[PDB]
Design a protein around this motif. Structure first.
Motif, PDB file in Angstrom:
ATOM      1  N   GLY A 502       0.606  -1.315  -0.014  1.00  0.00           N
ATOM      2  CA  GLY A 502      -0.033  -0.144   0.125  1.00  0.00           C
ATOM      3  C   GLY A 502       0.852   1.098  -0.158  1.00  0.00           C
ATOM      4  N   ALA A 503       0.105   2.362   0.165  1.00  0.00           N
ATOM      5  CA  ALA A 503       0.927   3.865   0.197  1.00  0.00           C
ATOM      6  C   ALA A 503       0.088   4.230   1.593  1.00  0.00           C
ATOM      7  N   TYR A 504       1.452   4.992   2.253  1.00  0.00           N
ATOM      8  CA  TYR A 504       1.180   5.643   3.632  1.00  0.00           C
ATOM      9  C   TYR A 504       0.519   6.871   3.376  1.00  0.00           C
ATOM     10  N   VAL A 505      -0.142   7.372   4.153  1.00  0.00           N
ATOM     11  CA  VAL A 505      -0.902   8.579   4.518  1.00  0.00           C
ATOM     12  C   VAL A 505      -0.366   9.071   5.751  1.00  0.00           C
ATOM     13  N   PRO A 506       0.776  10.116   5.815  1.00  0.00           N
ATOM     14  CA  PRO A 506       1.116  10.773   7.118  1.00  0.00           C
ATOM     15  C   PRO A 506       0.028  11.609   7.776  1.00  0.00           C
TER      16      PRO A 506
END
Ligand SMILES: [Mg+2]
Length: 830
Positions: A502-506
């Motif tokens: 996945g792609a992380y969202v800070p």
């Protein structure tokens, strides 16, 4: 060498104006005689001003006429030719005693040098001197008897003194104060060096020629629009300068003979005047329309050439600057029918004359303190290219005619973008970390408040969480929001999201709840990874996993082995993270950044700076900012350790220095505003172990860079530039020069990245001209999450890369290329 004090340097330039007054107030001339004093004395006896002296008397200079026609003649080919005709021009005269006409006579073939002082001569006046010297010698071999002059210059001065008091002087002053009202005081031509405080009169010149074809086409173009050859060049040069300087109006000066009345054409003396020609170029005029505008203003100026230009300056600018000439800084002189000019009274002075072959030739004199020679040569190339386009079609828009040469265009587009570097294009961000775990499993990877995680321990924790994310539907292009303060588990979460595909969202907990809730709902993540203590709740079917604390213990039961490449299924073209940016006034936009661009960004950084396993990087940037992307993953991809800074620990002013010294921090990042606070903080000189400081986010003042050197003489300072939509940074400049400029450049594009400075029509601008920065290459982000219309607006097709589907990002930033192929940030385009 040892620098001069401020008083020494300023006085040196004042003494340099003394030599400027020696070369600018004389009229040199050289005539060679090939053949076998009566003519010299005959010229003086008929020219009343040749024997005129000047002295002071009762608070005013007076004129003293004489009747002594006595010429003061004075009596290695390469050395004697160029040098002694230069000294003959620099030879100072005396207004009182001694004549004002100097001559040297030295050898069948003889060369006679003639020199006059400007107070009793012009450039036209020596052409009259050549008319009589060529005739009086032919008569004294085969003054008043042969031909008599109608007047003397003293009578013209009496006419002028009366005219300056009459009403016609007041009317010509009214036209100029109206014609030049509100004109730009200084042309903004791009200079290779900042303009000095005091005007430097050092000058040089280049030779330019209009070939027989262009000269004929310019004559035909001039005949069709009723203008002359000088007026056509004036329109073109004014069109080029306004295009290069980015200004709507330009003012160009021109010396005129001011001998309109046929009575004064045979006399010698000071007659030359100066006219300021204000040319407007707003509204995108055509070649035909521009020539008509120049025709209206040249004729209106040449009829008002009686008023001295000094009174025009006193009325318009009673207060003026010391760094440039008043009213105008560019001059065009036409010499319709001499040593190389080494003195520049203006920024650029274009001298052109019509030769015998019909071709137009001349010189372009430039102030060497402002421009390099190659810049002036390209400037002359633009003018000739612009003139040729006007001849090709006089109905096209003048400001869109192509002026770039093929050599500069290739250099701007290709040569200065030659950044192709072969990096692995099949590896993801977390796979760089995993490759390093196998090289050094027991090396220290993470440090936080005494706690440590080795590379293998960090990898195993991330694999456990990644399997729990996989069980919750995390996969390629799916988002995982992460809400935590800095701690070991923050890095575990980021790697686990990447490992799960996945792609992380800070989500920085410091932001207000409203913004966190918007980002959490806009990204629509599969999972929210949350630190214990945070109360953020997504709802909306989003799974919430605890990042630490007792509620995180369930996913410790997952096996610590890595997921296979087919289990996660992630590929470099899949998303690595979505980082939000606030677009001026509006909702934040989620920037979708893919793995391949992040890998390129990290691999260039290691190639450029060589981080070694023994070093430590300080993670001090809030992870909502993409600067933290390389703070996290650069050291972890090469074997170094990452020191996690205390959450809001910098609230203690001494924490940063204590941590740098206590943890042997070698690399850290500062926005220029925080770098100023760092060099001003107490104990900053204790940080002599620091190796690299990266600056980005704001303009880096040169004075701050110099201050950092005096505080930490060992640190390597690097200036980086790049928007979120182009993966952190795309250009870099090392501040390693012995002397740093006030404006620190943003540098050269990084690996597999291209830069373009384009005008409003998407065309490249000449070197030094400001335009909008466009970014190409593998680091251009996929776009804005859920905002496709804005994506198409800012992510446009790439017409230069030679690759189908490539895209450019329109930064909205203004920049320009420098001579050395480096970029300079100039601010926002708006
Ligand atoms: Mg950036």
């Amino acid at each position: 060498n040892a620098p001069l004090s401020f008083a020494q340097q300023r006085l040196w330039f004042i003494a340099q104006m003394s030599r400027e007054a020696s070369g600018a107030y004389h009229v040199p001339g050289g005539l060679r005689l090939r053949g076998e004093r009566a003519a010299l004395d005959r010229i003086m006896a008929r020219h009343e001003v040749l024997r005129t002296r000047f002295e002071w008397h009762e608070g005013e200079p007076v004129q003293c006429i004489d009747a002594e026609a006595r010429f003061p003649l004075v009596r290695g080919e390469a050395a004697e030719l160029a040098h002694w005709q230069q000294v003959e021009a620099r030879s100072p005269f005396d207004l009182g005693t001694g004549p004002l006409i100097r001559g040297r006579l030295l050898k069948q073939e003889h060369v006679l040098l003639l020199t006059m002082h400007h107070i009793v001569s012009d450039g036209w006046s020596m052409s009259v001197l050549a008319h009589e010297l060529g005739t009086l010698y032919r008569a004294y071999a085969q003054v008043d008897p042969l031909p008599a002059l109608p007047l003397q210059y003293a009578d013209y001065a009496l006419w002028q003194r009366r005219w300056l008091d009459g009403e016609r002087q007041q009317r010509q002053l009214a036209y100029w104060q109206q014609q030049l009202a509100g004109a730009p005081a200084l042309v903004s031509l791009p200079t290779d060096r900042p303009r000095p405080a005091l005007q430097d009169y050092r000058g040089d010149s280049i030779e330019l020629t209009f070939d027989a074809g262009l000269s004929q086409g310019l004559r035909a173009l001039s005949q069709r629009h009723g203008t002359t050859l000088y007026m056509t060049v004036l329109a073109a040069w004014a069109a080029l300068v306004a295009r290069l300087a980015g200004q709507p109006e330009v003012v160009i000066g021109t010396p005129v003979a001011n001998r309109q009345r046929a009575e004064l054409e045979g006399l010698i003396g000071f007659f030359v005047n100066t006219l300021a020609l204000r040319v407007d170029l707003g509204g995108e005029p055509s070649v035909a329309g521009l020539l008509a505008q120049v025709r209206e203003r040249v004729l209106a100026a040449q009829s008002h050439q009686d008023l001295p230009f000094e009174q025009v300056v006193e009325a318009l600018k009673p207060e003026r600057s010391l760094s440039h000439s008043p009213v105008f800084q560019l001059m065009l002189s036409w010499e319709s029918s001499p040593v190389r000019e080494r003195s520049a009274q203006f920024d650029l002075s274009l001298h052109l004359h019509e030769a015998a072959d019909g071709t137009v030739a001349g010189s372009l004199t430039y102030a060497s303190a402002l421009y390099e020679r190659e810049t002036v040569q390209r400037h002359a190339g633009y003018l000739k290219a612009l003139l040729a386009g006007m001849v090709a079609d006089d109905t096209q828009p003048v400001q869109r005619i192509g002026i770039l040469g093929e050599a500069e265009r290739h250099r701007l587009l290709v040569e200065w973008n030659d950044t192709a570097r072969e990096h692995p294009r099949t590896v993801c961000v977390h796979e760089l970390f995993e490759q390093q775990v196998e090289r050094s499993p027991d090396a220290v990877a993470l440090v936080y408040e005494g706690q440590q995680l080795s590379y293998r321990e960090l990898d195993r924790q991330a694999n456990r969480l990644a399997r729990q994310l996989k069980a919750l539907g995390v996969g390629p292009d799916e988002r995982v929001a992460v809400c935590t303060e800095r701690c070991l588990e923050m890095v575990v979460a980021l790697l686990a999201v990447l490992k799960a595909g996945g792609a992380y969202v800070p989500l920085d907990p410091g932001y207000p709840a409203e913004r966190l809730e918007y980002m959490l709902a806009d990204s629509a993540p599969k999972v929210l990874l949350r630190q214990s203590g945070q109360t953020l709740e997504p709802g909306a079917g989003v799974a919430v996993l605890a990042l630490d604390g007792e509620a995180s213990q369930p996913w410790q039961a997952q096996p610590a082995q890595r997921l296979s490449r087919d289990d996660s299924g992630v590929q470099p073209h899949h998303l690595a993270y979505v980082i939000y940016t606030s677009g001026s006034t509006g909702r934040p936009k989620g920037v979708m950044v893919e793995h391949a661009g992040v890998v390129n960004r990290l691999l260039w950084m290691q190639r450029a700076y060589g981080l070694q396993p023994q070093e430590a990087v300080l993670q001090k940037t809030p992870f909502g900012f993409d600067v933290s992307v390389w703070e996290f993953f650069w050291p972890l991809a090469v074997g170094a350790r990452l020191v996690m800074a205390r959450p809001q620990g910098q609230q203690d002013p001494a924490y940063l220095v204590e941590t740098i010294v206590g943890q042997d921090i070698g690399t850290l990042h500062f926005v220029p505003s925080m770098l100023q606070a760092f060099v001003d903080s107490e104990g900053v000189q204790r940080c002599r172990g620091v190796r690299r400081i990266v600056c980005s986010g704001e303009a880096l003042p040169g004075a701050l860079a110099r201050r950092l050197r005096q505080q930490l003489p060992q640190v390597e300072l690097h200036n980086l530039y790049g928007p979120t939509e182009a993966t952190v940074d795309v250009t870099a400049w090392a501040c390693d020069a012995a002397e740093l400029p006030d404006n620190i450049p943003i540098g050269r594009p990084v690996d597999n990245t291209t830069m373009y400075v384009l005008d409003a029509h998407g065309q490249p601008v000449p070197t030094g001209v400001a335009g909008e920065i466009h970014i190409g290459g593998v680091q251009v982000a996929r776009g804005y999450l859920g905002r496709p219309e804005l994506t198409r607006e800012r992510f446009v097709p790439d017409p230069y890369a030679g690759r189908p589907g490539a895209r450019l990002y329109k930064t909205g930033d203004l920049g320009r290329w420098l001579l050395d192929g480096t970029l300079e940030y100039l601010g926002r385009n708006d």
